[PDB]
């Protein structure tokens, strides 16, 4: 709507680098465009070429083309979300370890926001993969894409992004009681704790998967969950495996699913 512009100044580049580029830091470029296609693609058409991204971020204003999983899109209006994409050098870590990387990333986004919001605990986390959920609301949606060496790590974060421009299902900072959210702050905040995950995932901390079980709204809870090709299965989520997969409980057998999309059954 018209007066949430007035919610949506620019972000600052040059502020933004000055806090995450630097000694101590594993971020090595920060760029900040008008807009773009899709972010997620742009890095993935510099590794194509030859670049190394590892370590390089591209943040835009607004997003025209946006990626979602399964080969679905993202909405965004200008300077109502922050989009960004990271290049992760994966080529190191074993192929089984992959998944965690998508979970880690959702993980960092809302750690980066939880403070902000005045909900009560149990209704704020992780809905596997990584959406993060708010109220029943999807906050943020996470995209992983490989590009070897690299994985290209996307963020959509909606953070003054009204629900009736992109989604039914969706909300944002604004709509969940923070007034005046600073897309600045909320980045560099952002940035530094997925950092950290990524740091974590590399050198397979357990304290990844501890973190990611405790700020789960997907685990012991009835769900349908849509697999990749139309087919349904309904159980209950028990936990996490090793290589980031969903283990359901159906009707005492095991199901493990790789990939898919869940339904908290209310
Ligand atoms: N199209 N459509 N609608 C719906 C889509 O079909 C659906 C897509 O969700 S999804 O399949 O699980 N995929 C994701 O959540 C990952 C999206 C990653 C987007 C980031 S943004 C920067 C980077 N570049 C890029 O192209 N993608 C990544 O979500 C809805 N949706 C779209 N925009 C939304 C939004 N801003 N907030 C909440 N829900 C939204």
Redesign the pocket.
Same mark, same amino acid.
């Given at each position: 709507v018209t007066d949430r512009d007035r919610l949506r100044p620019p972000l600052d580049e040059r502020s933004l680098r000055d806090q995450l580029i630097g000694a101590g830091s594993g971020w090595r470029q920060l760029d900040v465009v008008a807009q773009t296609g899709?972010?997620?693609?742009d890095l993935l058409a510099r590794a194509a070429s030859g670049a190394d991204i590892d370590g390089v971020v591209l943040i835009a204003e607004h997003?025209t083309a @946006?990626? $979602?999983?399964?080969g679905?899109?993202?909405?965004?209006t200008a300077r109502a979300?922050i989009?960004?994409?990271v290049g992760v050098r994966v080529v190191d870590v074993p192929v089984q370890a992959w998944g965690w990387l998508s979970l880690a990333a959702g993980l960092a986004v809302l750690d980066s926001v939880a403070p902000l919001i005045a909900v009560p605990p149990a209704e704020t986390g992780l809905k596997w993969p990584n959406?993060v959920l708010a109220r029943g609301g999807?906050l943020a949606?996470?995209?992983a894409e490989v590009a070897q060496p690299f994985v290209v790590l @996307?963020? $959509?974060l909606?953070v003054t992004?009204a629900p009736e421009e992109?989604?039914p299902?969706?909300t944002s900072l604004l709509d969940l009681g923070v007034a005046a959210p600073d897309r600045n702050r909320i980045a560099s905040r952002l940035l530094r704790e997925l950092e950290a995950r990524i740091i974590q995932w590399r050198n397979a901390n357990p304290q990844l998967a501890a973190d990611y079980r405790a700020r789960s709204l997907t685990i012991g809870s009835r769900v349908r969950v849509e697999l990749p090709g139309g087919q349904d299965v309904v159980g209950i989520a028990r936990d996490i495996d090793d290589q980031g997969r969903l283990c359901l409980d159906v009707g005492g057998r095991t199901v493990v699913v790789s990939a898919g999309?869940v339904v908290h059954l209310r």
């Open positions: 899709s972010t997620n693609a997003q @946006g990626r $979602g999983r399964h679905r899109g993202w909405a965004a979300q989009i960004l994409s959406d999807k949606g996470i995209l @996307g963020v $959509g909606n992004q992109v989604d299902d969706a999309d």
